[PDB]
Amino acid sequence: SKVTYIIKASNDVLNEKTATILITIAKKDFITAAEVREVHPDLGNAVVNSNIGVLIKKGLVEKSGDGLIITGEAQDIISNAATLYAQENAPELLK
């Protein structure tokens, strides 16, 4: 997971943890907190919940009923980030 690009496009508001949780939510619309927790065994279950909350208080994620979905702000960081990465790895990606 390419969190350095994310932390970069976020002007360093994001750390390695809030960045990795952001990608998971970005990747699956209406994903739940319980599934975000399961794909990050590395992290504490209450750590994931905290950092999801830190992402809602920043205007990057919002809750839709039971599910989690990323804001337009968040998708600017994601598209910036992936374009950065893609250009630094282009000949490796394009084969």
UniProtKB/Swiss-Prot annotation:
Protein function: Required for the transcriptional activation of middle promoters. Middle promoters are characterized by the presence of the conserved sequence [AT]3TGCTTNA (MotA box). MotA binds directly to MotA boxes.
Protein name: Middle transcription regulatory protein motA
Native organism: Enterobacteria phage T4
Full-sequence portion shown in this chain: 2 to 96 of 211
Other known facts: MotA synthesis starts immediately after infection and stops abruptly some 4-5 minutes later.
Residues within the DNA-binding region(s): 22-41
